[PDB]
Design goal:
The structure is cut from a larger assembly and holds chains A, B, C and D. By secondary structure, chain A is mainly alpha-helical. Chain A is about 70% helix and about 5% strand. In chain A, strands 2-1-4-3 form a four-stranded mixed β-sheet, with helices on one face. Classes of the chains: A mainly alpha, B mainly alpha, C mainly alpha, D mainly alpha. It is classed as immune system.
């Protein structure tokens, strides 16, 4: 079992050998860096419908990494920069030779005594056409794999959103009832002024523990704590921050991005086109086999098959089939470009969610602060009520 | 001490508020208070989004919408003007 | 109480927030059109 | 900001003010550049977002060709970043301070500036700037503006 991985950031075919299957967790990252053109610092990969891979757990822990259930990869800088997913397709030397040969064959005239070379070229063309149809089938698979990486991205969005919503809505709703609890806190602040007066009036075994607790919670620090707690506790500070958190959520909430077009609806047409290309390759192979049978027929034709124009007919059929195949090669290259096309089309919603993520990352620093604040509120209520009783 | 009780209540209530609990515990005297308060904060967040959304809805002034017809008169006239300017520059 | 875990000192709102959210979704669609 | 500012983005916002304290007006064009750059990066925008929108609103006719162009560019970059109707409400009011007409592709900076009014003579305020006590003269100018809109 060799690792199967598609850079969900590209949703593109960049697999791994089993050689990295059992290596360290950072081994997959370094493989994407070296084998794939995907560095480490600005990169990411997580489990679709699961957690982002930790530094210890193996892939199968979240069972994935297969040719049909691989892991999803994301280049951090990819969205970090505008970077409409680059499709700087590797040297088309294969495609360039295919184009040159197809042009020659179309310009290739009828063959008289050149039937052997024509059949050799036709067989080479059929084999190359089959190889290209297979490459394009793998491309359509990598398109479905970009779709799977998009599913993984939606899952990761949902997950991170659930964590953020947990923390945020927790602090928020807690303050929601804390409103009346805020009146209780106001009564407690009256009692706090009273306790300040008492402490002024009370200069200085359980008492030992209380005083020890007093050492790291000095009087001025506690007074400043209450004051700032109220001030930033300005209810608007939440309700406006409430609108803020809702906005971060929404920024995450780009419904149309996921429901792009029913990506399966177009992936079905893509698969049908791949099937048509495979059928064309099979027809080309059938025509090459017919060409071999026709070479046999021409050899045996010295006596019983003396009808004329056989070599010319063979050359013409070869040229016609070559033109037909080159035609599909056009759609093949069009899909090669549509790779980067849909790549940028996705990178759009990608950046949408990612910017929502960074803004909600500031929001989550604020939400950790809000936790700390609500904690301060309640825990101080209890412990500082005790300490202020004096 | 109570923080966990409240926090757990908070987390549990939101979890239930998320729709992950049974309708029985709601009758809990503590449950109902959070039930209203939880729904209170929920509507509060709904507003936290909706108020901002509505703010620009009017702020999306139709002035440019009026500017849309301006191109119709602007477009052909500026085309003629640019053609004349090109001819003048050429001469 | 089991949801209370404290001494015995003694729904539709979600639907209202949801109607508000539906209006907010209409507003977001309006924002996209704008 | 590429990989260090998700939450410290505001920690850069203080760096934002510090750069606002920068000396070079060419450093100011670089500032508008890095402005658009963060608008891409983000993670502390909303508050600083509207802050920059308002601040530029007067700086709109800024007479620094480098500064003016880089401002229109950071403006288009922000229009991408925040985009949405948020652009209209937050900036287009701030944008009204310069746009002679609402004729521009805000996704573009050249047309955007074309909408904006011609930048004022920076030289005139600079000779005005060249002065020393303009601070009180600044209050006098505020009073004159109130004369324009006031009593």
């Amino acid at each position: 079992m060799k690792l199967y991985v598609f850079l969900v950031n590209t949703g593109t075919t960049l697999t791994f050998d089993t050689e990295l299957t059992v290596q360290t967790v950072a081994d997959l990252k370094h493989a994407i860096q070296s084998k794939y053109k995907i560095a480490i610092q600005h990169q990411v990969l997580v489990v679709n419908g699961g957690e982002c891979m930790a530094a210890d757990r193996r892939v199968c822990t979240y069972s994935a990494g297969t040719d049909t259930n691989p892991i999803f990869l994301f280049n951090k800088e990819m969205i970090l920069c505008d970077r409409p997913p680059a499709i700087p397709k590797t040297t088309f030397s294969t495609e360039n030779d295919m184009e040159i040969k197809v042009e020659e064959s179309l310009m290739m005239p009828a063959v008289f005594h050149t039937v052997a070379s024509r059949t050799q070229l036709a067989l080479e063309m059929y084999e190359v056409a089959k190889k290209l149809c297979s490459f394009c089938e793998g491309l359509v698979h990598d398109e479905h794999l970009q779709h799977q990486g998009w599913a993984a991205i939606m899952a990761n969005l949902e997950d991170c959103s659930n964590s953020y919503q947990k923390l945020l809505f927790k602090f928020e709703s807690i303050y929601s009832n804390y409103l009346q609890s805020i009146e209780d806190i106001k009564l407690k602040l009256t009692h706090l002024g009273t306790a300040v007066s008492v402490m002024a009036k009370i200069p200085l075994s359980l008492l030992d523990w209380i005083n020890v607790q007093d050492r790291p919670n000095d009087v001025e620090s506690l007074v400043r704590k209450c004051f700032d707690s109220m001030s930033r506790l300005d209810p608007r500070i939440i309700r406006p921050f409430i609108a803020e958190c809702r906005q971060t959520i929404a920024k995450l909430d780009n419904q149309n991005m996921k429901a792009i077009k029913g990506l399966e609806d177009r992936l079905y047409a893509l698969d049908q086109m791949i099937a048509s290309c495979g059928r064309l390759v099979n027809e080309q192979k059938e025509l090459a086999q017919g060409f071999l049978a026709n070479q046999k027929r021409a050899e045996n034709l010295k006596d019983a098959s003396v009808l004329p124009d056989l070599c010319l007919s063979h050359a013409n059929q070869l040229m016609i089939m070559l033109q037909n195949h080159r035609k599909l090669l056009d759609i093949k290259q069009k899909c090669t470009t549509a790779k980067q096309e849909l790549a940028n089309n996705l990178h759009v919603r990608l950046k949408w969610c990612c910017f929502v993520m960074l803004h909600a990352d500031q929001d989550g620093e604020k939400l950790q602060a809000l936790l700390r604040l609500v904690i301060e509120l309640l825990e101080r209520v209890k412990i500082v009520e005790a300490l202020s009783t004096v | 001490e109570n923080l966990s009780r409240r926090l757990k209540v908070t987390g549990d209530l939101f979890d239930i508020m998320s729709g992950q609990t049974d309708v029985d515990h709601p009758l809990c005297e503590e449950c109902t208070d959070t039930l209203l308060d939880q729904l209170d904060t929920q509507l509060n967040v709904t507003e936290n989004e909706c108020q901002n959304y509505k703010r620009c809805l009017e702020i999306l002034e139709q002035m440019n919408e009026d500017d849309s017809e301006q191109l119709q008169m602007e477009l052909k006239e500026l085309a003629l003007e640019e053609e004349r300017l090109i001819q003048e520059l050429e001469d | 109480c089991p949801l209370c875990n404290t001494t015995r000192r003694r729904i539709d709102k979600k639907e209202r927030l949801s109607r508000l959210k539906s209006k907010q979704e209409e507003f977001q669609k309006e924002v996209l059109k704008a | 900001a590429a990989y260090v500012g998700w939450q410290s983005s505001s920690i850069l916002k203080p760096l934002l003010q510090q750069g606002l304290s920068d000396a070079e007006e060419f450093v100011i064009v670089k500032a508008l550049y890095a402005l658009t750059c963060m608008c891409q990066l983000g993670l502390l925008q909303k508050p600083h977002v509207y802050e920059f929108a308002s601040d530029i609103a007067p700086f709109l006719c800024h007479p620094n060709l480098w500064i003016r162009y880089g401002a229109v560019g950071f403006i288009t970059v922000v229009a991408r970043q925040i985009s949405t109707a948020d652009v209209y409400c937050k900036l287009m009011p701030y944008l009204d301070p310069y746009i002679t007409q609402p004729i521009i592709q805000i996704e573009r900076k050249l047309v955007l500036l074309s909408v904006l009014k011609e930048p004022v003579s920076r030289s005139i305020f600079d000779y005005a700037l060249r002065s020393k006590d303009i601070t009180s003269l600044f209050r006098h100018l505020h009073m004159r503006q109130k004369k324009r809109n006031g009593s």
